[PDB]
Design a protein around this nucleic acid. Structure first.
Length: 50
DNA sequence: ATATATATATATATATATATATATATATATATATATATATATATATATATATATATATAT
């Protein structure tokens, strides 16, 4: 009951064409900490070359 | 009448053949257990499509 009968191929679906663009890489998430710093950056005082 | 010899009833001893009882060893069948490979099923992450909810907007 696992022989293969000679019935035709009808409704032949073509899909999953392996375009190399379709691959996306793993998105490993980071959860260690947060970048809260939003200081005013007062070091911006003018000191520029002559 | 006498003297001899034999026969009948019953059991025991010895031999022959049949059959059963006992034991062992073997071959066989079988059950079973294991191992391998394969297929199948479930869980998780992500992409895709469908459906619903909410809101806007036309007509009364």
């Amino acid at each position: 009951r696992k022989q293969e009968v000679p019935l035709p191929a009808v409704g032949v679906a073509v899909t999953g064409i392996p375009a190399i663009e379709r691959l996306r890489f793993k998105e490993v998430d980071d959860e260690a900490e947060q970048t809260l710093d939003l200081s005013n950056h007062a070091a911006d005082l003018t000191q520029i070359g002559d």
